[PDB]
Amino acid sequence: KYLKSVLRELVTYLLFLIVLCILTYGMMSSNVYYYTRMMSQLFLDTPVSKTEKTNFKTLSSMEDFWKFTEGSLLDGLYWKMQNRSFIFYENLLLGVPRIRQLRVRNGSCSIPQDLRDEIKECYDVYSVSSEDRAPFGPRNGTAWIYTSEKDLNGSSHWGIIATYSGAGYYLDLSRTREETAAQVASLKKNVWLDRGTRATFIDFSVYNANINLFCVVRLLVEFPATGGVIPSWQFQPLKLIRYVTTFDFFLAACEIIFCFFIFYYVVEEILEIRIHKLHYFRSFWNCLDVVIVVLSVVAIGINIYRTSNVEVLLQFLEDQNTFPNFEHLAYWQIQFNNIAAVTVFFVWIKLFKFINFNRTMSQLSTTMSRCAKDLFGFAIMFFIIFLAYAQLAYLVFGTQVDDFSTFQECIFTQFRIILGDINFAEIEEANRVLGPIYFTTFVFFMFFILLNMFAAIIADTYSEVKSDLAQQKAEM
Amino acid sequence: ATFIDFSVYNANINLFCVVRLLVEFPATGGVIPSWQFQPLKLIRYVTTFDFFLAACEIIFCFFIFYYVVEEILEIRIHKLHYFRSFWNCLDVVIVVLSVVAIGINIYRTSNVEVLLQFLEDQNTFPNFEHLAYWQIQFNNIAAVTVFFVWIKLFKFINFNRTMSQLSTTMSRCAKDLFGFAIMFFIIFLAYAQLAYLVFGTQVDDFSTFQECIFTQFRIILGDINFAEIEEANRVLGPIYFTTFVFFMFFILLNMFAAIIADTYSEVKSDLAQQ
Amino acid sequence: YGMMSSNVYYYTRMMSQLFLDTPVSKTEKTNFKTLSSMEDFWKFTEGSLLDGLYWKYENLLLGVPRIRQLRVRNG
Amino acid sequence: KYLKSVLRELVTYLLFLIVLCILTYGMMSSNVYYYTRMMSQLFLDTPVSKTEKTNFKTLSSMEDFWKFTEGSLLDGLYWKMQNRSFIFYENLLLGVPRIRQLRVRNGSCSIPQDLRDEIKECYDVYSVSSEDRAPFGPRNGTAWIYTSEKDLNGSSHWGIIATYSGAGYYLDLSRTREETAAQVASLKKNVWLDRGTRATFIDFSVYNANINLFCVVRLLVEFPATGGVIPSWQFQPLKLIRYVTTFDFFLAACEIIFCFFIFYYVVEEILEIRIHKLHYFRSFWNCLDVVIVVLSVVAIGINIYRTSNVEVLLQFLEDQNTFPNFEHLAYWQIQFNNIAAVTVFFVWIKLFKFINFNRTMSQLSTTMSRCAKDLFGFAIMFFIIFLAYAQLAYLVFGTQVDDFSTFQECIFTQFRIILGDINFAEIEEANRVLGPIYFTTFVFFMFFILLNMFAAIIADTYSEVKSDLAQQ
Amino acid sequence: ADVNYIVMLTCAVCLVTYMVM
Amino acid sequence: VQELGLSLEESRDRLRFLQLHNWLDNRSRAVFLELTRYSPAVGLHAAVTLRLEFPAAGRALAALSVRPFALRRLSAGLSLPLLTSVCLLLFAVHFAVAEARTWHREGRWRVLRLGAWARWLLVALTAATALVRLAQLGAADRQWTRFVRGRPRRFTSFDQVAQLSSAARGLAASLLFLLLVKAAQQLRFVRQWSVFGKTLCRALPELLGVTLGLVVLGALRLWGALRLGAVILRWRYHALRGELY
Amino acid sequence: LLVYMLFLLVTLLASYGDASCHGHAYRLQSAIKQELHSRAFLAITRSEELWPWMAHVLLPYVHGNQSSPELGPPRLRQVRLQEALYPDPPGPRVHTCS
């Protein structure tokens, strides 16, 4: 026999793959790319004013942030409809935008008494233990009174420099430009962004009723304690009113079928986890099954948790004069996409378990399997020198090059040098003598001396496997 | 959508020109412009070389008739197992492509007398989109035909012993190359789907599936950008890049080298021994 | 080789430069490759299109140009 | 014994290579390639006028060409002083440019009977048997005189699209802008050329007083009878005033020493030919010596030709109102490149002869005998596929890509794709289908098959040679 | 939330040397 | 040298008054412009300099460089660099005495041995790393006390400390890189993984020789262009693994 | 093995013991160069725009209300070498120094 079981095991896998492919096709349309592109180009490409040539991406001073927040920002937000405000006469700006900042207090750090006679105040790096909570300025409204993270219904962000909190001093802008401009001018007249600020957030959302699909926007400007301006942005095309069309019902049915399939697989895996064999971890085709099941279970858990709580949208729809809070939904959508992509990638990789239909594929699979052990053995030795080079580059160049700034960047730039992409002219001025020595020795050693070992091992293993297979056939 | 088009003559150099300017308004707002320009020459009667090219075309038709009659009289000999040669299933491609080219050319030149009667510039818009469309297909068909006829020189060139050895090396390993290319493309499509799901809406290099495939091919060529991949996803982006680079440049690529190398060595050893 | 002249590429590039590279108007820089709004499209319609069409490059128009529109319905 | 023949010869070859390198050290500047590239790139930057900006590639229609002709078409060389006309006080108004144009005659064939009244100006391709000397226009001056090229101190054309003979007419500029502008304006009033011109060549000689070295610029234009014109331009650093200081004497002494060494080697070979094995070619290693002898003979002939041209050119500069005739010694840069290649080949031969002292670090790199040809079978089958792809790309593209405009540079574009420089910004919209297909099927068949087999072909050779060495 | 690398490096070295020993 | 004044209006007045005299306009080999940028938030200093070169009377060449460092004086006590830069001297002395105890033990002719030379490069590197840090600490302390002595009127040019703080960090990274290479070498003890290192050992001589032969013949990519090294590595690895089994 | 591990621990303490200000130094230097308009300061090639440069972007930086605490007045230096040279022939400079 040995063929009736494999046929069922293959047809069920093909059905599951078809269902997953339909499901992943249904979630990735073509309008979202252009939607995001128009939003980004409207908000991140237009200059601050007609004379200045700096956009949001090239902010370089705290004065430039004030110049941007009145001008390009207000031009993008409020459009004179031929009251409400449609972004492109298509995208509706629902609610009102909100701006908030995080600041620290004076005397946070300690200047040495040797030079205390000239330095009066200091402000350390951002930290939860050393953030200001006292009122300042004219002291009327929420822009000058500290508000707890719990009352703001926010969460952390994990910015480039650090992980900011959700608290701070916030202010809800108006619904029309004539009042938002006045509010921003009032915030600028009194000193609201002094040396003590560390971050500033601007966020809003749009609907674009033509295609039922939201879009949340967040703009973050970071002020490090060492000076400078670090901008950031994020656009997320959410979708919260899913069940409108027939295709949406079809997608829901496909999701239910996928849940049934994953239940059947977990049942049939827990069935054979002990019956056919106990403690079978030497196959690598069953260690993949548990990964598939775990990833899919996590995906369904995230999906069922995210869509179960949409009370924010309803409570906004009761009264549309307040700021909608859609941060958590966007975060969970990003997490769900990240999980689903990996899940489908492993599902596609799983296909290798069945392509053994003839001698040509069987011998190739045998060659690939037999050469895994020594390749793994040599990979450790290769990566030891690779990480030694990475740490050398990080220590020597990791402060004046902008490309070796952190360890991950050193790893990635060495991988790119393996591809022969990165030029060497930006290292000699960083360091005159050790720069080109590093580049030359690294390319000399890793480029062919330690790189063709993989090819040699693979070639020798394949040749000897083929020779043995041919020899045993003739011996029989 | 909005279409703007017209036709141009330019009496100086006898080359017509039909244009088409397209501006698209997506449902999300914005403008997407596009264009296409296509010169045309439908006189072909200017000097003594007109009859030269006519004679060339008619003798080409005679050659095509000879080739098709030769093939059909060969069909009078063994019918099946005729396709497992790669030099007989290609000659039918040659004749069918050339016949399609001849038919499309005669169809295109059949409707030309309407083109001349607009130099008076009457008050009527000419519909010239069919002629432009049929000038694009003909060029592609001719290019593919000339490519294949250039390729078909190997069946004559392999009578040299070294050329024969290279041809034997190629023929004896094609099955292994196809078998391994299946696995290679399965892995390639898995990575392409991963990238499309992750960087679908931000990079403009992974806007669509085919664009993802072409971007991965350029990555293999060594044309990574990596400036937008890292910012599109701080995690799981660099992971994808590093794993793709490792698996491709370290493992998958060398298998082709191993197959070709040992196949060539085995073939030459067997040939010398025999 | 006979059916491939050299004038076609030069003529196509010249037409592209005439109709796609010139600015819409002497006051802004938005040529046809960088349309961003309906107003810019209108400015092009009274602008570079008319200049390149009825030129004082030395080509002559035959027939008459036509403009067409596609649209959808409300609701 | 058995060691002098592998040591003295190697030492002599190394000394000859060192002498050649010393001679070539003060022969040409290190930026010769960059200078040549800059000269070739900036040879098509002629504006039209103050009204229109129709450049050379933007003036093909009526008014564009009219604007290009009327303007600074002849004002590039002559500039107003802060007479004389020096752009940067390096090339003063010492001489005038020359223009040569070759034409043919029509009516050298019979029109068809059907088109007897339709085809009258039916002219075939220009050839040697289609030479005419019929002048047209009103005879008012000496600019419409008929003359040959042998008696006018000239040569042939050697064009791109048409290699016409020396027949035609010649035109010379002036030594000042005041007369040149008036002459150009008078000529532009009426017609100046016909449609029967086959080849056109503009030759300019410049003194370049900043650095003592003759400079020649050549611009070629040829129009065939099948339609289309192939334009080209190039520059050559002619060597005719190289006698400046003791460096010229040192170079002459080095050339004399090289000639004496070549003569001694030829004498030794002759003495080792008639009294030894002669008319033998079944060695497959002596061909290197034959090629070295041929290269030395070619270098000697090039030096002799340069000396003859210099001697002939010594009769110029008689008056202070003529131009320097440099149309006979324009093979100096090519000769210098050939000399550098010969020196490199001599160094390679010396290294190959002296590498025998290596125990095993050079024995594995000597596989030419085992690989006698053994490799052209791959080069031919690679170039056939390369030309097939080049033809396919030049046919399917070539109208809306701005890159694949002509074959010779389509080859370069595919080479750059192989090297890693990929654009892929114009192929995709030029043709959405069959555009990406070309790129993918090209990269797959180049980077996975052919470039991967050319490694195996030398791998198996190395393994075979190592097996022979081990078994021996 | 500031991290001190001294104790981390010391413990890592101790654990690694224990494993090899 | 000029002090560029002390006040904002004084700076402008000095600039104009001294600029109407043309003191650096004719010859002016170089000018230079350097200043300090202490930051209290992170406890880091910064040596900033702006150089401007006049090679030819007319055209001027300009460049700049900013070197940040952490000023830590030797007299601060028993700071971590001081503790870690004195036991490194002890390790260097231990290695030197251990190699000297072998030199005389074996006699002479201990040259042309990598083990006899790799153990002296390590000693030299450790000694240099130990001494450069002490020099940096001493220089930093001297500069700081000089500055505090004349704070309202002196400049003290902290650039030397920035130079030494980078040299020491480079040496400390090179030493760690060498240690990591040694750790990689120590991986051969696995029975099935001992093949790689010794195959490399037998392959390097001829490989370097033939690379030198090719480079003499010519910086074009020939070796790694497509493949040659894999050819030799495959043969040597196959032969050695066949002998091993 | 114990000696090797101890030496590795010592060198790790020497090297990465203070490897927490490494990022801060990078951010500081990036902030300093961008503020001084480094790309603008390198763009100047004549000996007259230097004065408007350091008269509108350097003085407000070094001298200000708070203006990035300084710790020391800046200095200006010069060298003239007393063997005054002459302008070179026109064209590219002699990039070997004379």
Ligand SMILES: *[C@@H]1O[C@H](CO)[C@@H](O)[C@H](O)[C@H]1NC(C)=O
């Ligand atoms: C913060 O406190 C310090 C300590 O007295 C003081 O010098 C400084 O002026 C204070 N900052 C503000 C903004 O008042």
Ligand SMILES: *[C@@H]1O[C@H](CO)[C@@H](O)[C@H](O)[C@H]1NC(C)=O
């Ligand atoms: C704060 O409140 C006072 C009291 O009503 C009001 O006059 C003032 O305009 C408000 N804003 C500021 C900036 O003082």
Ligand SMILES: *[C@@H]1O[C@H](CO)[C@@H](O)[C@H](O)[C@H]1NC(C)=O
């Ligand atoms: C935060 O709490 C709830 C959200 O569930 C909401 O009713 C309240 O208005 C929110 N407050 C602000 C300031 O958004």
